[PDB]
Paper text:
The mutants were named according to the numbers of alanines in their sequences (i.e. [name]-19A stands for a [name] variant containing 19 Alanines) and a suffix ‘a’ or ‘b’ was added to distinguish variants containing the same numbers of alanines at different sites45. All six variants crystallized under the same conditions, indicating a minimal disturbance of the surface properties, even upon multiple alanine substitutions. X-ray crystallographic analyses indicated that all of the simplified [name] structures fully overlapped and that the main change that occurred upon the number of alanines was an increase in the solvent content in the asymmetric units. Thus, favorable protein–water interactions appear to be the most likely factor responsible for the increased unfolding enthalpy of the simplified [name], rather than the relaxation of atomic clashes or the creation of new intramolecular hydrogen bonds or van der Waals contacts, assuming that the hydration structures remain the same for all alanine mutants in their denatured states.
Here, we report a structural and thermodynamic analysis of six extensively simplified [name] variants, where 19–24 of its 58 residues are alanines, using differential scanning calorimetry (DSC) and X-ray crystallography. However, the alanine substitutions exerted a small unexpected enthalpy stabilization, and the magnitude of which increased in a nearly additive fashion along with the number of alanine substitutions, which was, however, over-compensated with entropy destabilization. A structural analysis indicated that new water molecules were recruited into the spaces created by the alanine substitutions, facilitating protein–water hydrogen-bonded interactions as well as interactions with the methyl group and creating hydration networks around the substitution sites.
Residue numbers in the entry: 1001 to 1057
């Protein structure tokens, strides 16, 4: 899969509490996490569907 999909989710430094999805290769599933609203990495999607389409080849 895309290497970015293997990275840990990144909340980043922002003050917001936004629910986003990362692909968790360990679980083989998309999972919610809290994103702070700034400096997203690529393993960070609006929905489980978007995460699987990008990362679950």
């Amino acid at each position: 899969r895309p290497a970015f999909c293997l990275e840990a989710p990144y909340a980043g430094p922002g003050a917001a509490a936004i629910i986003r999805y990362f692909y968790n290769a360990a679980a083989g599933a998309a999972q919610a996490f809290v994103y702070g609203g700034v400096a997203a990495k690529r393993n960070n999607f609006a929905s489980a569907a978007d995460a699987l389409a990008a990362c679950a080849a």
